[PDB]
Amino acid sequence: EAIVNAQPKCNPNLHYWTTQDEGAAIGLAWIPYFGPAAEGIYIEGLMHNQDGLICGLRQLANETTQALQLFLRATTELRTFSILNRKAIDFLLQRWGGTCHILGPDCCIEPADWTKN
Amino acid sequence: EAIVNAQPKCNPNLHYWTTQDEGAAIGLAWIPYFGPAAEGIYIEGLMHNQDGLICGLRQLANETTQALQLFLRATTELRTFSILNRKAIDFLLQRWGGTCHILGPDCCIEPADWTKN
Amino acid sequence: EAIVNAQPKCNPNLHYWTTQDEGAAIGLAWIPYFGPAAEGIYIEGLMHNQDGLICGLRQLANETTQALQLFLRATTELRTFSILNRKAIDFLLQRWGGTCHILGPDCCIEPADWTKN
Amino acid sequence: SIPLGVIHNSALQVSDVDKLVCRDKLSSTNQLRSVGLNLEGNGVATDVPSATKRWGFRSGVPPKVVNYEAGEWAENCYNLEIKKPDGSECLPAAPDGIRGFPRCRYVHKVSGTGPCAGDFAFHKEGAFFLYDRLASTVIYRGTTFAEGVVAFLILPQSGYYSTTIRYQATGFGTNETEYLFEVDNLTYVQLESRFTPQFLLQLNETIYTSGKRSNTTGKLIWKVNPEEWAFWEXXXXXX
Amino acid sequence: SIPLGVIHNSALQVSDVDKLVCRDKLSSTNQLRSVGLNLEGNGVATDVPSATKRWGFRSGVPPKVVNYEAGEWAENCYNLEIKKPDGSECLPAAPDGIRGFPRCRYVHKVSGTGPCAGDFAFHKEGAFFLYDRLASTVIYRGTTFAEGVVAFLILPQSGYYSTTIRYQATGFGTNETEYLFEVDNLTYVQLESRFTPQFLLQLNETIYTSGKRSNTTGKLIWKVNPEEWAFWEXXXXXX
Amino acid sequence: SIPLGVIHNSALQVSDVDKLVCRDKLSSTNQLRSVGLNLEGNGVATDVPSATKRWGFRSGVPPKVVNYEAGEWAENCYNLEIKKPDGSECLPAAPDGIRGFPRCRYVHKVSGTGPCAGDFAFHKEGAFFLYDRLASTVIYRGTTFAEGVVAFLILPQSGYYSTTIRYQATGFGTNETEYLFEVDNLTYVQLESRFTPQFLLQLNETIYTSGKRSNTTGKLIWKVNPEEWAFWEXXXXXX
Numbered sequence A, B, C: 001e002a003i004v005n006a007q008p009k010c011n012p013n014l015h016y017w018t019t020q021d022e023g024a025a026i027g028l029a030w031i032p033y034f035g036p037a038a039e040g041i042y043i044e045g046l047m048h049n050q051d052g053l054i055c056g057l058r059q060l061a062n063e064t065t066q067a068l069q070l071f072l073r074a075t076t077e078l079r080t081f082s083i084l085n086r087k088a089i090d091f092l093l094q095r096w097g098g099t100c101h102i103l104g105p106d107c108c109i110e111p112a113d114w115t116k117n
Numbered sequence D, E, F: 001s002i003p004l005g006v007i008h009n010s011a012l013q014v015s016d017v018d019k020l021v022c023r024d025k026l027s028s029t030n031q032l033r034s035v036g037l038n039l040e041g042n043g044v045a046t047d048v049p050s051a052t053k054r055w056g057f058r059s060g061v062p063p064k065v066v067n068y069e070a071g072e073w074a075e076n077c078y079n080l081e082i083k084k085p086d087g088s089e090c091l092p093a094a095p096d097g098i099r100g101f102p103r104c105r106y107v108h109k110v111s112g113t114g115p116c117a118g119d120f121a122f123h124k125e126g127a128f129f130l131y132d133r134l135a136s137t138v139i140y141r142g143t144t145f146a147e148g149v150v151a152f153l154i155l156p157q158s159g160y161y162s163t164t165i166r167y168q169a170t171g172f173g174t175n176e177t178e179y180l181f182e183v184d185n186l187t188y189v190q191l192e193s194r195f196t197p198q199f200l201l202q203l204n205e206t207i208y209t210s211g212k213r214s215n216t217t218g219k220l221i222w223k224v225n226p227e228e229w230a231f232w233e234x235x236x237x238x239x
């Protein structure tokens, strides 16, 4: 469905921290011996509520909790790192798990430029 | 090949335990603080030997052991959680690892509804 | 790009050790109780510098280090076992992550044997 | 199924597995992201008395940990050192590789005692304790964390200043818990929910500059006469 | 390659990688399942003397663990507390997150001594020790487990009662091992393979009700005069 | 992005994500391989004084580990037992499941002392410490390792003899480190970079056969008068 924000409040701005995707370091900063300590490996950013995304995210995370918790109850893995990779595999299985019927609704094959030939 | 049961005996019935796939809990049972203890997170089921599946499973597991053990000898991972995901990735690579030749035997693309157009 | 070897030296020969891919053991050697100890689970091989592969590998590994290190800085996983599986998933997403436009440059679908029909 | 967030028609939505939309393109794992969002942003009370009441001890439930890649700067964080009346630790040591939450404006360090009738401390509302890119279902001893939740989504194709506010607690985890804001090791201020972090900081500063600290060897406690907005928008008296 | 089970033509089969059948549809990871099946169902002897003879100590082989998602209710399980004659533990403590097998009708708790000429206890027939959704190649101290094997397959698109039977052992892991069924801390019954769990339970009950327990401070041992079906279908004499 | 090696036009190349070539076929995960290659093969100095100078102690950086599937037989390996002057260990014990490098012709076991002004020992050039199918960013105590780097690639669709050379060190990890080659527990030879492993072995053998060992209870140290190719192609004097 669509995400409906049912929280008492919503901070519309998002001051976020994360880690850089690669980001070839200046000179020798990539060597662990010379690199930054654990506290200084973060990049920061600011995101506003365009398209109401921020507030939606806050609801989305809330709504995720239940399902996530149930998953974590069923797993014997102490630390779970594989949710996103499993979701990517499921994305591929949804489209290409079976034979693709061209022009079908569950087949993502476009014979448009082949039609004009 | 086909699975041939070579065991001295076969319990044809399968009283099984497992964990629920999500299964949105009644009310607040999903919160770990309120949820069931480790001993009470299991669902139970009974499966009979239709199509001779049960007995076959017992052979299959037996036959798996060797291969599994060899795998576990070669891995440095203390706990292996990735066999099924690797098998899914291999399933996708088998079909879509290379270019798909329509009408070919190793291409799972059906231009049937496109043929009648 | 292409791999340019910029090392002071290159051992053109590669005396390598690894673990066998399955390799159904002779008799009962697959049982851990009877199997080899940790020190005797390796196979050995010798590879020469045909097509200049060996030297290239030595450069490739060197060139990988930076990127690898940055990755290991960003991850909270103590031991990373998933790089190759993630790369396979990325291989599949590159080709089949979106709808496939037949005859397009980013679609690996060949309607050749279907063209002659 | 764990919900997955996707941007459709200029709005975030939860994607349904029972619906294949070929328009969405997932070209690499870089498009997939896990996100941690603090309860602070939903308007929950962040004062120590209110925050602690959302946590409770329980046994028989194995702890669980899940990683997340990006997080939100927090106004309020918490760091607990709780022991039983006999001195045994109430919370487990942080497991290897679990560090405190990386961005906290105020770290509420609470030290005290409680019954701790449970092997682990869980969130009574099902939320998570957010650490450095790891979210746990339980509280670790002496490790800074924020209350938060995790979301998963598909992307389409000044400086940092931290201040530590120290508290003393008795009866931790019960309905008769008592809290003291610590000015120094012998000066304390009775605490209630009304006290905001900046208010506590200014109380401490004026107590120091006005000499109201304990100039004796004993413990001095201050109760304050009176004297609903979100942050992003020997006893004696003080009147 | 690790075999994968698939249902073809109303029968389970092992799928061959050297064969692409487009008919099979794997639409999600939910179709893939790992399964643990107990040796009990293959007809192996489950009495303690027979079961123990299938395990042995060995060094130089690192232990390995693999998870499985579903398991089978077990009639017989085992729980070992073995020490060397000098009192040092023979088996390693259970690693974090490894709990006992979740469904056992009878748990054969064995305590005793043996040489234990090996760093770990392995299955001599290559089988696995089944724990709670984790299968190990080695036995963990004081942790309930069942003997079993693991299978992997692709799906197509009363209550629980447990009873603990206690044993004492000497010379564990050798060809001269001796076992005693424990009635109480001072009453024991000589054990052999013929003794089924229910038979042991009724022996214990009649010994208790008939007063045949040790009414002294010494150890009393009972040998029984005599007095091949599967479950799913101071010495003295007792004759 | 982590580079991936692929064989194109009879030559190895780094594949660019910004280029889809449909000709490449990845039919199974067996085609993907991780490889460990020793710095030895790039021509780096392998003598203990030179090798140690490439490692250094640092704090604040969590250690990291990545696995690799295949490795190269090494001429030179290293095994460190370093302590501070007060006897506290300078390196952490090997974590569970991390064994020494599996193929070493010479293992340079170094024991001694140094300041060790850092929580972990890292490679100053960013290389990795190669263990048994695991590469770490830090050195583990008493565990044999080789200096190396890791590569990832897509495949297209005599015996083993090891010798241990023992050294003593003072001021480990500084610019005034001192090394002694150990002949026995009371006989030592002053060491410099010029000394190759076979040269040290023959020095030891001739010292033993010529009786130049310490025939007293004291420590005897030998300095040697003089008396750039790669391997694959009480003091006194010795002149």
Ligand SMILES: *[C@@H]1O[C@H](CO)[C@@H](O[C@@H]2O[C@H](CO)[C@@H](O[C@@H]3O[C@H](CO[C@H]4O[C@H](CO)[C@@H](O)[C@H](O)[C@@H]4O)[C@@H](O)[C@H](O[C@H]4O[C@H](CO)[C@@H](O)[C@H](O)[C@@H]4O)[C@@H]3O)[C@H](O)[C@H]2NC(C)=O)[C@H](O)[C@H]1NC(C)=O
Pocket (backbone or CB within 6 Å): A006, A007, A008, A062, A063, A065, A066, D042, D053, D124, D125, D126, D127, D149
């Ligand atoms: C996702 O987002 C939703 C919405 O924001 C959150 O919903 C909250 O859920 C919790 C419980 O899961 C609710 O807390 C409960 O409130 C009940 C009634 O509310 C009292 O307080 C409100 C003021 O907030 C008054 O208006 C009202 O009249 C009540 O006085 C209580 O009865 C419950 O009590 C239980 O706990 C107490 C504390 O120990 C015990 O003493 C009781 O015996 C009893 O066990 C409980 O406190 C909360 O009100 C909900 N908020 C809203 C706005 O609806 C989700 O929690 C959130 N998900 C996650 C994972 O964070």
Ligand SMILES: *[C@@H]1O[C@H](CO)[C@@H](O[C@@H]2O[C@H](CO)[C@@H](O[C@@H]3O[C@H](CO[C@H]4O[C@H](CO)[C@@H](O)[C@H](O)[C@@H]4O)[C@@H](O)[C@H](O[C@H]4O[C@H](CO)[C@@H](O)[C@H](O)[C@@H]4O)[C@@H]3O)[C@H](O)[C@H]2NC(C)=O)[C@H](O)[C@H]1NC(C)=O
Pocket (backbone or CB within 6 Å): B006, B007, B008, B062, B063, B065, B066, E042, E053, E124, E125, E126, E127, E149
């Ligand atoms: C998958 O399924 C198969 C079939 O059920 C199982 O096969 C069993 O394999 C084990 C060994 O791996 C076999 O055990 C061996 O038996 C040999 C001969 O059998 C004796 O016992 C039978 C009664 O079962 C008699 O009929 C026969 O005449 C023999 O007297 C023994 O010689 C072997 O001895 C070894 O171990 C003993 C015990 O320590 C030592 O004293 C010896 O020196 C020697 O080392 C061994 O015991 C068993 O018979 C097989 N069963 C069947 C029905 O074939 C697989 O094990 C199973 N896979 C897994 C992983 O569980």
Ligand SMILES: *[C@@H]1O[C@H](CO)[C@@H](O[C@@H]2O[C@H](CO)[C@@H](O[C@@H]3O[C@H](CO[C@H]4O[C@H](CO)[C@@H](O)[C@H](O)[C@@H]4O)[C@@H](O)[C@H](O[C@H]4O[C@H](CO)[C@@H](O)[C@H](O)[C@@H]4O)[C@@H]3O)[C@H](O)[C@H]2NC(C)=O)[C@H](O)[C@H]1NC(C)=O
Pocket (backbone or CB within 6 Å): C006, C007, C008, C062, C063, C065, C066, F042, F053, F124, F125, F126, F127, F149
């Ligand atoms: C991938 O492959 C490349 C190429 O082989 C490797 O490159 C080496 O990189 C390291 C540093 O990362 C270089 O070492 C540095 O050398 C500087 C100058 O070189 C001196 O030595 C050479 C002889 O090799 C002389 O010709 C020259 O005149 C210099 O005297 C030094 O100034 C640096 O000093 C730093 O460390 C020292 C030691 O503690 C300190 O005292 C200093 O204060 C300073 O901090 C440094 O030693 C090396 O020269 C490069 N080799 C080549 C051939 O270019 C990569 O390292 C490799 N990648 C990986 C991951 O292995």
Ligand SMILES: CC1(C)CN(C(=O)[C@@]23C[C@H]4C[C@@](C)(C2)C[C@](c2ccccc2)(C4)C3)CC[C@@H]1N
Pocket (backbone or CB within 6 Å): A014, A016, A017, A018, A019, A020, A021, A047, A057, D033, D035, D036, D037, D070, D071, D072, D155
């Ligand atoms: C930091 C990056 C390098 C990687 N991405 C990301 O992590 C965010 C970048 C922004 C937009 C996101 C949709 C993705 C959500 C975001 C986030 C972080 C923390 C809490 C909530 C949300 C913020 C992480 C994208 C590109 C960005 N430049």
Ligand SMILES: CC1(C)CN(C(=O)[C@@]23C[C@H]4C[C@@](C)(C2)C[C@](c2ccccc2)(C4)C3)CC[C@@H]1N
Pocket (backbone or CB within 6 Å): B014, B016, B017, B018, B019, B020, B021, B047, B057, E033, E035, E036, E037, E070, E071, E072, E155
């Ligand atoms: C428990 C579930 C929720 C999930 N599945 C499953 O685990 C079994 C459900 C049955 C049929 C399976 C083929 C799959 C094998 C099965 C099993 C369990 C233990 C030992 C052997 C076999 C039993 C697990 C499917 C759907 C079921 N309702």
Ligand SMILES: CC1(C)CN(C(=O)[C@@]23C[C@H]4C[C@@](C)(C2)C[C@](c2ccccc2)(C4)C3)CC[C@@H]1N
Pocket (backbone or CB within 6 Å): C014, C016, C017, C018, C019, C020, C021, C047, C057, F033, F035, F036, F037, F070, F071, F072, F155
């Ligand atoms: C050992 C195997 C069973 C598996 N493979 C492999 O590991 C190598 C076999 C050779 C060729 C490779 C391209 C792949 C690189 C190689 C390697 C090993 C160590 C350092 C550097 C390189 C050597 C591993 C392939 C097939 C081989 N027969």
Ligand SMILES: *[C@@H]1O[C@H](CO)[C@@H](O)[C@H](O)[C@H]1NC(C)=O
Pocket (backbone or CB within 6 Å): D175, D176
């Ligand atoms: C706290 O809870 C206990 C539970 O029995 C109750 O007896 C007591 O009166 C409560 N006290 C307060 C302050 O609510």
Ligand SMILES: *[C@@H]1O[C@H](CO)[C@@H](O)[C@H](O)[C@H]1NC(C)=O
Pocket (backbone or CB within 6 Å): D185
């Ligand atoms: C305050 O008390 C703590 C705990 O005993 C102690 O570690 C700290 O040094 C004290 N601070 C001062 C300023 O005395």
Ligand SMILES: *[C@@H]1O[C@H](CO)[C@@H](O)[C@H](O)[C@H]1NC(C)=O
Pocket (backbone or CB within 6 Å): D164, D165, D166, D201, D204, D205, D208
């Ligand atoms: C309290 O005020 C003193 C004096 O300004 C200052 O040194 C100290 O850090 C303050 N304490 C806190 C917790 O802010």
Ligand SMILES: *[C@@H]1O[C@H](CO)[C@@H](O)[C@H](O)[C@H]1NC(C)=O
Pocket (backbone or CB within 6 Å): D210, D211, D212, D213, D214, D215, D216
């Ligand atoms: C001295 O002690 C008194 C009583 O504790 C206190 O009120 C005062 O602030 C202290 N400082 C002074 C008197 O300067």
Ligand SMILES: *[C@@H]1O[C@H](CO)[C@@H](O)[C@H](O)[C@H]1NC(C)=O
Pocket (backbone or CB within 6 Å): E175, E176
């Ligand atoms: C047990 O095995 C040992 C092995 O040497 C042998 O000496 C002994 O006679 C055996 N005893 C039995 C009861 O088979």
Ligand SMILES: *[C@@H]1O[C@H](CO)[C@@H](O)[C@H](O)[C@H]1NC(C)=O
Pocket (backbone or CB within 6 Å): E185
């Ligand atoms: C039996 O002995 C065990 C081990 O010493 C002890 O823990 C247990 O309490 C005893 N039981 C009785 C009823 O004495």
Ligand SMILES: *[C@@H]1O[C@H](CO)[C@@H](O)[C@H](O)[C@H]1NC(C)=O
Pocket (backbone or CB within 6 Å): E164, E165, E166, E201, E204, E205, E208
């Ligand atoms: C033995 O019998 C007594 C008396 O009925 C009972 O209390 C006890 O639990 C029994 N022991 C076992 C191991 O069944």
Ligand SMILES: *[C@@H]1O[C@H](CO)[C@@H](O)[C@H](O)[C@H]1NC(C)=O
Pocket (backbone or CB within 6 Å): E210, E211, E212, E213, E214, E215, E216
């Ligand atoms: C008393 O002791 C004797 C000898 O141990 C035993 O046979 C009997 O069962 C015990 N109980 C009695 C006599 O009631």
Ligand SMILES: *[C@@H]1O[C@H](CO)[C@@H](O)[C@H](O)[C@H]1NC(C)=O
Pocket (backbone or CB within 6 Å): F175, F176
């Ligand atoms: C070693 O480095 C220190 C760093 O201050 C310096 O004082 C000293 O002179 C150096 N010694 C050598 C042998 O280079």
Ligand SMILES: *[C@@H]1O[C@H](CO)[C@@H](O)[C@H](O)[C@H]1NC(C)=O
Pocket (backbone or CB within 6 Å): F185
């Ligand atoms: C040499 O010294 C070491 C360390 O004290 C000791 O373990 C070893 O046994 C000694 N070797 C001889 C031959 O005395």
